[PDB]
Amino acid sequence: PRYEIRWRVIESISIYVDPMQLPYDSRWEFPRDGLVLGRVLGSGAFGKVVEGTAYGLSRSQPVMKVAVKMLKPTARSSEKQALMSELKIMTHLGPHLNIVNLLGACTKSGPIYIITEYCFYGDLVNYLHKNRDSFSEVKNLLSDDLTLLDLLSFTYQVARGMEFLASKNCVHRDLAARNVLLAQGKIVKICDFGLARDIMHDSNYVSKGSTFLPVKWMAPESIFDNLYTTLSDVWSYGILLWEIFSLGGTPYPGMMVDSTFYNKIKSGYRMAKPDHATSEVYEIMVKCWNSEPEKRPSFYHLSEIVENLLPGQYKKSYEKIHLDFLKSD
């Protein structure tokens, strides 16, 4: 077992892109001297993510806080290769406002560093736990100045980030609130934060076969048939929405994951409406949990549905932030 990003890019359908055969664009190379490493953000079985300060990484932000992914110093050569593969996948996908973007890398001599965007508020689970008891207000949704509109904002941005990944034929395969970070301005950023975890000793991951999988977040066809698609990501999106509107509850609370659980879900059991979900939001969840994958809504359609649940002025505010992101270099 080794660390590996869970994302997979579809090459063709009758086939996944082999990230080892992708090129590494040396334009991402950043001098190690320009990085000052700081405190740990998360530490897992194979490596860690740490805060850092990057000097001259951005012409517009010559001193910038970043996050840095790295392996333990004992990492085998096959483990380093997987970090290269993650680097190549991020280069291949390109940037979007609602993913944790690649900013640079140190690959030339010594340990491999992946330099990514830093997300001030951390992961969505901890953010919801911090602000659970608190549950120009509309204008302050997308700023640093909890309400139902905050939850709907998170819901919308994850759909836009996921719509982007799907447009690149990328399947996440571990979409969950622990893999959604919140950056400055309450901007949602989807990622794979697995480097910060030990899935062999994590109650969110369950021994199945020769590995540990996020079964409570997985569509039936992924559990039984090992089939992962953008439509199985949609199922996980519905489970993620349950996390959000339960303000950080664990899915299927009090239920143990075992053979009984798999067949129960397969037989049609679904989670009840979380306490702070509206009827419109719960109907979205129910649609995402269709047994037939092709009955599940696309992320493009999900973005359209959720946008219509938000104030009109929210959409303009989002596109101003999105415009700033596209113009910034």
Residue numbers in the entry: 553 to 566, 573 to 693, 776 to 785, 790 to 973
Sentences from the paper on this structure:
Avapritinib is the only potent and selective inhibitor approved for the treatment of D842V-mutant gastrointestinal stromal tumors (GIST), the most common primary mutation of the platelet-derived growth factor receptor α (PDGFRA). Furthermore, we report the identification of a sub-pocket (Gα-pocket) located in the N-lobe of the kinase domain, which is surrounded by amino acids of key regulatory elements such as the Gly-rich loop and the αC-helix.
In total, we obtained protein crystals suitable for structure determination which resulted in a total of 12 crystal structures: two apo-crystal structures and ten complex structures of KIT-wt, -T670I, and PDGFRA-T674I bound to avapritinib and to different ligands synthesized in our laboratory. Similar results were also obtained for apo-PDGFRA-wt and -T674I, showing that the water molecule is located near the gatekeeper in the case of the PDGFRA-wt structure but not in the PDGFRA-T674I structure.
